[PDB]
Design an enzyme around this catalytic site. Structure first.
Site, PDB file in Angstrom:
ATOM      1  N   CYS A 103      32.436  35.080  38.386  1.00  0.00           N
ATOM      2  CA  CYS A 103      33.268  34.962  39.575  1.00  0.00           C
ATOM      3  C   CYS A 103      33.046  33.652  40.337  1.00  0.00           C
ATOM      4  O   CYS A 103      33.994  33.048  40.853  1.00  0.00           O
ATOM      5  CB  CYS A 103      33.012  36.165  40.497  1.00  0.00           C
ATOM      6  SG  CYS A 103      31.225  36.597  40.795  1.00  0.00           S
TER       7      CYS A 103
ATOM      8  N   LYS B 115      33.703  53.900  39.515  1.00  0.00           N
ATOM      9  CA  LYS B 115      34.687  53.699  38.471  1.00  0.00           C
ATOM     10  C   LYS B 115      34.291  52.407  37.753  1.00  0.00           C
ATOM     11  O   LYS B 115      34.421  51.306  38.303  1.00  0.00           O
ATOM     12  CB  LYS B 115      36.085  53.568  39.084  1.00  0.00           C
ATOM     13  CG  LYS B 115      37.201  54.152  38.217  1.00  0.00           C
ATOM     14  CD  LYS B 115      37.383  53.396  36.899  1.00  0.00           C
ATOM     15  CE  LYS B 115      37.938  51.987  37.136  1.00  0.00           C
ATOM     16  NZ  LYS B 115      38.088  51.211  35.871  1.00  0.00           N
TER      17      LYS B 115
ATOM     18  N   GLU C  64      41.945  30.658  38.256  1.00  0.00           N
ATOM     19  CA  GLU C  64      40.694  31.098  37.645  1.00  0.00           C
ATOM     20  C   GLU C  64      40.922  31.402  36.166  1.00  0.00           C
ATOM     21  O   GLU C  64      41.670  32.316  35.818  1.00  0.00           O
ATOM     22  CB  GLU C  64      40.171  32.348  38.368  1.00  0.00           C
ATOM     23  CG  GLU C  64      38.829  32.870  37.854  1.00  0.00           C
ATOM     24  CD  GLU C  64      38.177  33.890  38.795  1.00  0.00           C
ATOM     25  OE1 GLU C  64      38.743  34.989  38.990  1.00  0.00           O
ATOM     26  OE2 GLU C  64      37.084  33.596  39.328  1.00  0.00           O
TER      27      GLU C  64
ATOM     28  N   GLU D 289      34.948  41.739  46.714  1.00  0.00           N
ATOM     29  CA  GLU D 289      34.272  40.610  46.072  1.00  0.00           C
ATOM     30  C   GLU D 289      35.275  40.191  45.003  1.00  0.00           C
ATOM     31  O   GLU D 289      35.358  40.806  43.941  1.00  0.00           O
ATOM     32  CB  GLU D 289      32.950  41.047  45.424  1.00  0.00           C
ATOM     33  CG  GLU D 289      31.869  41.529  46.409  1.00  0.00           C
ATOM     34  CD  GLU D 289      30.998  40.402  46.975  1.00  0.00           C
ATOM     35  OE1 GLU D 289      30.930  39.321  46.350  1.00  0.00           O
ATOM     36  OE2 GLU D 289      30.373  40.604  48.040  1.00  0.00           O
TER      37      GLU D 289
ATOM     38  N   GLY E 178      36.421  42.375  41.633  1.00  0.00           N
ATOM     39  CA  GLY E 178      37.332  42.078  40.543  1.00  0.00           C
ATOM     40  C   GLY E 178      38.256  40.923  40.867  1.00  0.00           C
ATOM     41  O   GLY E 178      37.846  39.956  41.515  1.00  0.00           O
ATOM     42  N   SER E 179      39.507  41.023  40.426  1.00  0.00           N
ATOM     43  CA  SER E 179      40.492  39.970  40.668  1.00  0.00           C
ATOM     44  C   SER E 179      41.033  40.033  42.084  1.00  0.00           C
ATOM     45  O   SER E 179      41.036  41.095  42.717  1.00  0.00           O
ATOM     46  CB  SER E 179      41.659  40.097  39.695  1.00  0.00           C
ATOM     47  OG  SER E 179      42.419  41.264  39.986  1.00  0.00           O
ATOM     48  N   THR E 180      41.517  38.893  42.564  1.00  0.00           N
ATOM     49  CA  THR E 180      42.097  38.799  43.899  1.00  0.00           C
ATOM     50  C   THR E 180      43.392  39.618  43.957  1.00  0.00           C
ATOM     51  O   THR E 180      43.688  40.264  44.966  1.00  0.00           O
ATOM     52  CB  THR E 180      42.392  37.327  44.255  1.00  0.00           C
ATOM     53  OG1 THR E 180      41.165  36.588  44.233  1.00  0.00           O
ATOM     54  CG2 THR E 180      43.028  37.217  45.637  1.00  0.00           C
ATOM     55  N   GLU E 181      44.142  39.607  42.855  1.00  0.00           N
ATOM     56  CA  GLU E 181      45.397  40.348  42.773  1.00  0.00           C
ATOM     57  C   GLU E 181      45.183  41.835  43.039  1.00  0.00           C
ATOM     58  O   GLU E 181      45.892  42.433  43.848  1.00  0.00           O
ATOM     59  CB  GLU E 181      46.045  40.143  41.400  1.00  0.00           C
ATOM     60  CG  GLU E 181      47.257  41.034  41.125  1.00  0.00           C
ATOM     61  CD  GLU E 181      47.736  40.925  39.676  1.00  0.00           C
ATOM     62  OE1 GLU E 181      47.579  41.911  38.908  1.00  0.00           O
ATOM     63  OE2 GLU E 181      48.256  39.840  39.309  1.00  0.00           O
ATOM     64  N   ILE E 182      44.188  42.417  42.368  1.00  0.00           N
ATOM     65  CA  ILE E 182      43.873  43.841  42.530  1.00  0.00           C
ATOM     66  C   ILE E 182      43.239  44.142  43.897  1.00  0.00           C
ATOM     67  O   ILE E 182      43.410  45.237  44.441  1.00  0.00           O
ATOM     68  CB  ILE E 182      42.971  44.353  41.397  1.00  0.00           C
ATOM     69  CG1 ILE E 182      43.681  44.169  40.061  1.00  0.00           C
ATOM     70  CG2 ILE E 182      42.647  45.823  41.602  1.00  0.00           C
ATOM     71  CD1 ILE E 182      45.038  44.850  39.996  1.00  0.00           C
ATOM     72  N   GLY E 183      42.516  43.167  44.445  1.00  0.00           N
ATOM     73  CA  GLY E 183      41.909  43.347  45.750  1.00  0.00           C
ATOM     74  C   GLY E 183      42.974  43.687  46.787  1.00  0.00           C
ATOM     75  O   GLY E 183      42.756  44.537  47.658  1.00  0.00           O
TER      76      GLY E 183
END
Ligand SMILES: NC(=O)c1ccc[n+]([C@@H]2O[C@H](COP(=O)([O-])OP(=O)(O)OC[C@H]3O[C@@H](n4cnc5c(N)ncnc54)[C@H](O)[C@@H]3O)[C@@H](O)[C@H]2O)c1
Ligand code: NA
Ligand code: NA
Ligand code: NA
Ligand code: NA
Lengths: 494, 494, 494, 494
Positions: free
Chosen positions: B296, B186, B393, B262, B239-244
């Site tokens: 990143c 994706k 960030e 990551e 990607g972002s930590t939020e989405i992780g």
């Protein structure tokens, strides 16, 4: 031989272990631990909760601070300490085996000859890994010197089950301590005693305070506190698949801590027509009934080729009927009681479901005693893939025997499961053995044997039986945080 | 020595890639991809959703079946294919570099000399790993022959960001394919073009249908479908930590699929008083401004020792002021536009917050052009640890310079963060370098350099910057499922 | 805490050790072993020859037969045995240290705190390797299952020197036994006692008869018999370069047995101008004078940058003058006597040559006592590369100090030698340390330290200083015979 | 699918290759290379000697100097160059296959489909190793940072045989070049042409001058000059056991250069009574007759269980009698001529030896043609262990069939030899296969197959069949010089 046991061993530890000291729960609350053989309370144990977990985490974190005795300690010395802990456990072997049997229910002979021996071999194995898990010097492009440091992941939350109290603690402590981590362990409420006594041995061994902290208590409280804690770097969980989900969700919801899971299974034991009948029958019996059937990798789906099905079943039924159930301290006892009332009822429920769904009850099927949680060795024949007893993990002395025709067929049927912890193949043919061991979707595939564990060989599940591996060199991966250091140099050369 | 680019590269692929064939979304819906340099639409792209991801997973699963061409293929041959893919990418290097710049906004010179070069090196590195990631023969106790098979994890869902479109695809495909896995990728909605063209090259290279499937679309739809899919064995997200957090929670709530992350960072670049001024200044600039500051591991926390603070800041401001911002196709351009409007606005918001909280604005701070998403190279001085621009960030051309006194002080301040992706140290002192590289809690510690990546060296984060590692041998771990085979033998000997 | 020694311990073992039994030489001949501190005979020792070696080899070969107790023994158990051996050596630590000092001459404090400590750490390190040196499962082309078995090389002949009697024995036995090999060890005629007593401990530890056989005697007789034996599979030799040649020639002339050598050296210790004066001086002193200068990796070429030459030399001479020489059992003694008369005279001969060739004698240069083989700590200044004392291994308390100007200059001068066992660099500069460590052609390069050995790190020489490595994981390679097993399977899959 | 060959390929290279240029021997001397199929001279080739070797070694040493193009080149780039060489070899595949057959005598179809294919896979396999043979970061005791550098061994002298000209060159160059070493190769006087042409491709590929130098000539001259050279760091030799001794003796007598040997064999091919008859017969034939029987690992001792002996022999004789011998360029040809007259006569001598000692001649036994060096496929029955044809390597189309009764018997008989290069076992039984593969003292044990080589799997001998291994990861060890760097740090932490 086996030394005589003290059938009523005294309990010396029953509190929360933090900073090498014994503490009562902040709430001062205690919970009873029962002897499954009699149903009577052994003693009360400190019921740890969130607040107690917080104390343990802070202690662990403190012991993990740069410059601390644990961090500065030579890797080889960590190995020395692990070897010392093992020596201490061996010294108190007879006592630990007896206390294990008292709280768990498994036969004393087994606790002494199997559980304890495996505990010793596990710790001594990892003791040797302490100063051998090397990092790498990498030939990166350009004028640079690149290398990796294999550092400890940090504060490790370890939650273990009740089926193998001491052994599970060993599988967790061995790799964690060998790699220099700190631990906040949550033992099972059904079997907290043995682990707590070992903590006393950890202190006696010389481990710095805070390195290993044990918090006895319930899962939804103490366990969840560890899994959701903001300062726990990694969590290792061993238990049911259902709770495994909770653990992973808690990790993603909190601080994104690293996770490894060792869950349930519905392991297929495939007996080909060319197998050694006697051997296969005995091993299939052991594969299922071992530890009161309370083994995650239990061969709960015995596939038998049609040409030998009838004879196999006949011999299996006889072996099950001859299996001695009784007092775990009696040398003649092969099977003790189930761990508790909850499991006791669960299993009886599954047996009932087996009868309801059409499975042929060949022997057993009911309670084996008036006192305790004893269940008769039960065997179901003509089991079909769609039956509940063929899909769900029973975790008791209930054997399922299924019939099959071809090797291609059994592969598909064995692999048709959301579980994939282990599997076995019994055959004399080289090609069949290789074909099946490759085709089978399981973390461990045994050939002409079952339940063969070695501290040297990794164990773990495929699919929903878990993630990651324990034992062997692989068991060190989850307890290591890799750091890359890339330094600019005047002029790189080969 | 860069070939003149085609500033208006033709788009040949804009649909969903499944079974080596191009498909429109089941919903026939499409979404626009914008050229961040003009703000104008490049073209429409098939908007994949759940149903599309379902088709992709089935194709992948089918290609992973035992006995399939991809499963039976020699490990060495998988290496040959990865090498062919690299050759095809090199052939179309000039085109891909231009298409990258067109959709992403990064300078063409950088796309050609850096991104494409790194893409080629990554694929070729892993091509060599295909037949070398050995399993083990283990000296287990008793009369047994025990060994491990390093098998593929299976269907891997890979979700990648927009900052390095091609490179992120390579970091993912390289290890997955080398180990024999199948992919359902994706790509980012902001930069889907280059990855889709590469899919055409994957078909041309000879990869079996279903081995690599790309589904362009939005995150909450397509991405979530993959993370929550019941038949995806493993998910790798960057990607972002939020989405992780969303990803790991999705994995635990679904089928307990393996997960590697990551995430973001707020990497500290420590400049000691004995550092080479000129070099440290240039590297500090690159450390933060590279790829429009959309990295990143960007050195967004430049710690400078007081004795050299003033001069360092002066030189840094000058370098920031001279940084050429403009058309990414012009060879003189050092900085192109930000990827999109959302990022454009978010960055300006952070710059506003920086001014509001007391940070000293030294240069830039505003929009750099009338058309496109160009932002002036911004530098903030006298930044404090508690400031928003010092913790969050930004992901843009905004530099933060902080002052420190002691080496002990800087370690604590550098480590006081929930992030831990990378870090740097500039000094001529041996002991200082070793002290810091060891003390710093980050996945990668650069000494006297920054953003030095190598396909041979692992990259990943500490704490909430992610879990697991990519690149190097370590990059193969997450794409391997370990199976233990323990065979009974007549008599075991050393 | 150094326990009070028995300045005249009793000798319990002085014969040939075969099949866990003590034998007299077939010839019944014996040879005297002298106390270097008095020149007095300690006791007689069985003088083994070819016929005695033949008996040992046959015993070793028998213990190595397939199906024997040693071959069938679990790898982990070999580890237990090595750990037991260690525990036994620790029990008799005080005694061994004293006996070591009695036969060798080194200070008792050093024998106890250094030699024995290292012997214990060596055996324990390798004990942990016993069940961890895995073979591999290889993804070979075609329908095959290919793997490797790491088997023992077989009968290993091990010839060791007299400078570190016990430690050299451990360095050899540790890796050999951990990998399941059998040993026929030939100890030094000057120091046979301590090794022979250890053999008693080997028997007490539980090692099967024939696994370890020790044959005391002379080199041209016993030693050569082993090197030329038609049934010895591998030979590990540690000693002079001259004899190393004879060993490899003997191997090639006989049965082509595998060979590894740890020979002499003329290790350069480079002191850069920016080094820590006090530290460099003390380390350079230690680097050369350790173990009466009888160290293979001794820093016999002290290169000092001109700008700090004068001061360094002054401090060096002062330290050498204050070095206490006397009775090894006296706590204040830093330097004992030389091992024997031959070495005593050889050293004085070199000191004479140093004076004749123009080297500036700064202190010492003569005998330090009337009785025994004591030599005054000698320091030569203004030494030139072409001088004999700058090329040949002295193996005594004779320090060589050379002056240099540039870093490029010192690298070339340091590398201009047929030796390459070790080297050292003292500097505070990161780049200088890295430049030199990479450029220097030596098996081990120490930075800001010297003689830092660890059972975890490999040791060996470049050029004529030997071949192969000892200690660490590398130490297991030479004791392993790799077998490839390629099996035809029905259908190979990843 | 094999392209029609050029039966009279033109020779473009016939000189000495040094610094990427062609040179005549200093003596201007030349030697003829003969076409074994006709006995006619193909052309003359420069006869290299000591002085020519000295030139090559100096060039190699120069290319290996610190800071040289070859030393500074990125490890990944070395991989690129190896892949390029492979591509060039594939481009000229048809030509090289024909030239191989012309000078060697083996069938063109085999040269194309086997030899060349294997050459391609070898170089491509090792190309991948170039940047993956990592060193280690070691957790040594004390406040130190210890790690290892895997450096090239240096100037490598490589001496290869004539049985597999191109393949032997690949097995040598692949690992040496991948690890950054330099080469001085001495090819066989009987088959120098193909290797020399490959040298042209080496230059074309971009390899720096001096990295690979080829010196054609005789053994006692050129080969010996390499083995005894004072500036050659390592020598890898493949040939007869007799010469292997000379090589090791030369090494020990000169500069103690590292040595690896791949010698002869008398490999046992065990056929159990339960084996697949048809398959075993065809494989046993291939095992012995492949490459005109000129294979080091040839199954020269075919052990057959008595119950199936008669039938096996019958079928073996029939197959041998149907084996087509003739012009190697004719597609129908299975067996070409022997390499030269010397071998031709040797084989005839052994055939007569077999007749004289009582072996039953079942078929063949004489010359197969008037011109060339063709010999009839010969089969000997009822061979005994003590017969010369049962002990010595014939290296020709002469099969020995022995009869045995039990599995324990055959193990002892198969292992009763000074050779131990390879062995095979044909059986359907799992236990028998494992029992035998473990018991057999051979470097490679094939199960239900023979002559199955893979660049991934190591190959080498036990006992007098050689030392060290080639191919696989193991093939890199002998080409690596390990350096330990131990740095003192402020405070060592885990
Ligand atoms: O099979 P084979 O018959 O070719 O094996 P062989 O031992 O006869 O020859 C193999 C290789 O070694 C070389 N060689 C022969 N004698 C040598 C010597 N004395 N010193 C160094 N190299 C020598 C040969 O020229 C060839 O390159
Ligand atoms: Na209980
Ligand atoms: Na875009
Ligand atoms: Na002596
Ligand atoms: Na020829």
């Amino acid at each position: 031989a086996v030394p005589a046991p003290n059938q009523q061993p005294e309990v010396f530890c029953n509190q929360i272990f933090i900073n090498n000291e014994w503490h009562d729960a902040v709430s001062r609350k205690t919970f009873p631990t029962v002897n499954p053989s009699t149903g009577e309370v052994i003693c009360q144990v400190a019921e740890g909760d969130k607040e107690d977990v917080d104390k343990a985490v802070k202690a662990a974190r403190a012991a993990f601070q740069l410059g601390s005795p644990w961090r500065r300690m030579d890797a080889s010395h960590r190995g020395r300490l692990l070897n010392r802990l093992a020596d201490l456990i061996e010294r108190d072997r007879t006592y630990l085996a007896a206390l294990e049997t008292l709280d768990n229910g498994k036969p004393y002979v087994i606790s002494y000859l199997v559980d304890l021996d495996m505990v010793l071999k596990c710790l001594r194995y990892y003791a040797g890994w302490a100063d051998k898990y090397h990092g790498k010097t990498i030939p990166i492009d350009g004028d640079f010197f690149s290398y990796t440091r294999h550092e400890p992941v940090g504060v490790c939350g370890q939650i273990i089950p009740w089926n193998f109290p001491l052994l599970m603690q060993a599988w967790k402590l061995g790799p964690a301590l060998a790699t220099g981590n700190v631990v906040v362990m949550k033992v099972a409420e059904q079997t907290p005693l043995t682990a707590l006594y070992v903590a006393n041995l950890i202190k006696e061994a010389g481990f710095p305070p805070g390195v290993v902290n044990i918090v006895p208590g319930f899962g939804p409280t103490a366990g969840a506190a560890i899994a959701s804690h903001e300062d726990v770097d990694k969590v290792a969980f061993t238990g049911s698949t259902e709770i495994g989900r909770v653990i992973q969700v808690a990790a993603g919801s909190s601080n994104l801590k690293r996770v490894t899971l060792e869950l349930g299974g519905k392991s297929p034991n495939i007996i080909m027509s060319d197998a050694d009948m006697d051997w296969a029958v005995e091993q299939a019996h052991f594969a299922l009934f071992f530890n009161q059937g309370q083994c995650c990798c239990a061969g709960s789906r015995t596939f038998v080729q049609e040409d030998i099905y009838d004879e196999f079943v006949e011999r299996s039924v006889a072996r099950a009927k001859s299996r001695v159930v009784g007092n775990p301290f009696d040398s003649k006892t092969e099977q003790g009681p189930q761990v508790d009332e909850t499991q006791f009822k669960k299993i009886l429920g599954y047996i009932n479901t087996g009868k309801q769904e059409g499975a042929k009850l060949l022997c057993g099927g009911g309670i084996a005693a008036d006192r305790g949680y004893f269940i008769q060795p039960t065997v179901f024949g003509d089991v079909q893939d769609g039956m509940t007893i063929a899909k769900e993990e029973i975790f008791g002395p209930v054997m399922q025997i299924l019939k099959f025709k071809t090797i291609e067929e059994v592969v598909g049927r064995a692999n048709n499961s959301t579980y994939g912890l282990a599997a076995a193949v019994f055959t004399k043919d080289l090609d069949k053995a290789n074909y099946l061991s490759q085709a089978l979707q399981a973390g461990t595939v045994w050939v002409n044997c079952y339940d063969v564990f070695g501290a040297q060989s990794p164990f773990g599940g495929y699919k929903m039986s878990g993630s990651g591996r324990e034992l062997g060199e692989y068991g060190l991966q989850a307890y290591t945080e890799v750091k890359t250091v890339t330094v600019k140099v005047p002029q790189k050369n080969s």
